[PDB]
Amino acid sequence: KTIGLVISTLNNPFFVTLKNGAEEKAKELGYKIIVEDSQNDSSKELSNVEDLIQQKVDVLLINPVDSDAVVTAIKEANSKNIPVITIDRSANGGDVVCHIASDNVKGGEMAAEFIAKALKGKGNVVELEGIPGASAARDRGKGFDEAIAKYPDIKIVAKQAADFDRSKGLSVMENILQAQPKIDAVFAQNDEMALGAIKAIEAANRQGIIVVGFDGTEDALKAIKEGKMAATIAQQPALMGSLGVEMADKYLKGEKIPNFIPAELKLITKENVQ
Ligand SMILES: O[C@@H]1[C@H](O)[C@H](O)CO[C@H]1O
């Protein structure tokens, strides 16, 4: 028996960890696993899924590139009676037997609360959004807005997408720095964007700025120890991958499973890094 793992991109350390979590548990339970990289492209994702259907995989674990666009691939999986579990990001359609992810609205709230307290409830905040087609991104923005709105002297002065990517985080932060001489904090919706923003800030010789990421990647934790990043909202990618395989196993054994499993989040600062 064989599991198909379709991941949005392997250019993000977060997803490399998720991949490794799935692989470790698959060995443990005696499953083969085929991991395929969608390269943030819904077309590559569909071709990846079709390859896996043709290899006769017994279950499909998918981390969608886009909430709507993924439904075609899921509905092809459905037609061939291959069970689908979504991981980290939700699908807006098709039959999905389980979804495993963080409470990303709560994660955005956590980031906002930290920033608002750290800034004594006053200042200019920049938000670097992730891929808009990812539930994770949308949810973090919603939670962040909901929490920061309670602090009227905090103004979100720029809100721009940087596609969960380090390079785009740099370039976007460059532009924002040029357009905004007063920035007191930055929330990036993932660590890769946060690291890119840091590079832009250090390049511009800005001081000065409390940078908060999302994920708890090794590079982020190192940035925090070095004092380049103030905090991150740590996720459990390896556990998400592990649970995905676990629930696949149970489902394949004829057992009913919950249809949603939340993965816990933890705020990480210098005080508790590591
Ligand atoms: O949860 C994940 C991670 O934050 C990753 O860095 C980007 O994609 C999101 O869905």
Numbering used by the authors: 2 to 275
What did the authors write?
The ribose-binding proteins are members of the periplasmic binding protein (PBP) superfamily whose members play roles in prokaryotic ABC transport, chemotaxis, and intercellular communication systems. The two domains are linked by two or three β-strands that form a flexible hinge which permits the domains of the protein to bend towards each other in response to ligand binding at the interface between the two domains.
The tteRBP crystal structure was solved to 1.9 Å resolution by molecular replacement using the ribose-bound form of ecRBP as the search model. The tteRBP structure adopts the overall fold and topology that is characteristic of periplasmic ribose-binding proteins. The appTm value of the ribose complex in the absence of GdCl is 114°C; the appTm value for ecRBP under equivalent conditions is 72°C. Analysis of main-chain and side-chain geometry of the aligned structures indicates there are few differences in the main-chain geometries of ecRBP and tteRBP (0.4 Å RMSD of 235/271 Cα positions and 0.65 Å RMSD of 270/271 Cα positions and distance between aligned Cα positions range from 0.03–3.1 Å over 270 Cα positions). The loops and turns in the binding pocket retain near-identical conformations. A bias is observed for a gain of polar and charged amino acids on the surface of tteRBP (net of twelve charged and three polar substitutions), while the opposite is observed for the tteRBP core, where there is a bias for the loss of polar amino acids (seven net substitutions). The comparative analysis presented here shows that the substitutions responsible for conferring thermal stability on tteRBP are encoded in side-chain identity and location (core, boundary or surface) which serves to alter surface polarity/charge, removal of unsatisfied core hydrogen bonds and increase in core/boundary side-chain hydrophobicity.
